[PDB]
Amino acid sequence: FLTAVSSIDTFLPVLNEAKLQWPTSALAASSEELLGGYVGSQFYLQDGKYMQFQIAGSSNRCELRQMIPDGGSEIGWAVDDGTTHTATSSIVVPEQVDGVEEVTIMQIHSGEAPQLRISWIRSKSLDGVAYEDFIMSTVRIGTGDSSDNFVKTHLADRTAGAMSFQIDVKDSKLTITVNGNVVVNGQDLSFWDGTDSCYFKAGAFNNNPTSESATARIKFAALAWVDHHH
Numbered sequence: 001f002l003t004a005v006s007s008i009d010t011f012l013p014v015l016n017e018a019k020l021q022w023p024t025s026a027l028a029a030s031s032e033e034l035l036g037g038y039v040g041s042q043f044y045l046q047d048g049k050y051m052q053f054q055i056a057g058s059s060n061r062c063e064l065r066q067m068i069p070d071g072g073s074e075i076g077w078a079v080d081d082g083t084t085h086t087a088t089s090s091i092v093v094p095e096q097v098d099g100v101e102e103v104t105i106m107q108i109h110s111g112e113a114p115q116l117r118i119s120w121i122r123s124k125s126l127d128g129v130a131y132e133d134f135i136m137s138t139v140r141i142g143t144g145d146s147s148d149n150f151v152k153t154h155l156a157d158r159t160a161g162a163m164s165f166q167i168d169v170k171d172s173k174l175t176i177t178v179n180g181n182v183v184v185n186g187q188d189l190s191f192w193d194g195t196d197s198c199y200f201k202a203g204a205f206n207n208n209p210t211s212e213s214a215t216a217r218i219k220f221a222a223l224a225w226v227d228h229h230h
């Protein structure tokens with residue numbers, strides 16, 4: 001068998017507060033199964049150090065979903081509880097194979113919709129400007145499908161090396177920090193006030209591929225989910 005992610009220390013904290021959804025939103029592995037060596041080509045320890053996710057198919061996923069720690073059930077939190085909800089990661093996004101067009105690698109999601117997706121995308125025009133092979137944030141400020149429901153931002157061009165992300169939610173404001181630099185500062189999340197079902201996700205969620213067989217692949221050198229009280 002392939003080497004399991006839980007065979008080293010690095011990812012135990014997040015695995016203790018996650019379930020794995022694969023190849024759909026249906027459960028693939030509970031937190032205890034993840035901590036206890038769940039492994040396959042979709043989810044294995046790569047190069048002795050990376051938690052690697054792989055998935056093919058439109059809207060299929062191999063994704064961690066935030067859980068209450070220590071064997072608990074699904075978590076839900078609010079964007080304005082006065083704490084800071086923080087997701088940190090260090091991600092190697094390799095060159096994606098032909099047919100893969102957008103891969104969501106971190107999210108904030110609720111009972112109804114994704115508040116935030118951080119995704120790699122092959123090609124995209126944003127605000128009249130073309131970008132290629134880059135990392136994007138998509139924030140929902142509404143529940144509809146037209147442009148004004150979203151704020152989409154170029155976060156960084158994709159790099160060969162690891163790229164760090166920090167997602168902070170505090171007092172209905174979102175901050176995104178890439179390689180130590182604040183890119184998105186205080187994006188408003190007030191539309192979501194009253195929602196108590198938000199949670200973090202991370203991994204690989206395959207969006208709008210041109211081929212159903214093309215396999216997205218994303219490597220995490222680090223991932224953590226932490227609520228900071230103030």
Ligand SMILES: O=C(O)[C@H]1O[C@@H](O[C@H]2[C@H](O)[C@H](O)[C@H](O[C@H]3[C@H](O)[C@H](O)[C@H](O[C@H]4[C@H](O)[C@H](O)[C@H](O[C@H]5[C@H](O)[C@H](O)[C@H](O)O[C@@H]5C(=O)O)O[C@@H]4C(=O)O)O[C@@H]3C(=O)O)O[C@@H]2C(=O)O)[C@@H](O)[C@@H](O)[C@@H]1O
Nearest residue numbers: 021025026027065074107109112113114138150205207208
């Ligand atoms: O490309 C465009 O045309 C526009 O796309 C806009 O972004 C899109 C994305 O491309 C994706 O389509 C994205 O997909 C969302 C999807 O709409 C749902 O919200 C889905 O929800 C699932 C949850 O992630 C979660 O896995 C949930 O799990 C439940 C479930 O009951 C399950 O059975 C289990 O037992 O318990 C779990 C639980 O843990 O809570 O299931 C949900 C499900 O219905 O399957 O999540 C995906 C997602 O992961 O984000 O939607 C966005 C969008 O914003 O609508 C945007 O880029 C726009 O600019 C483009 O024009």
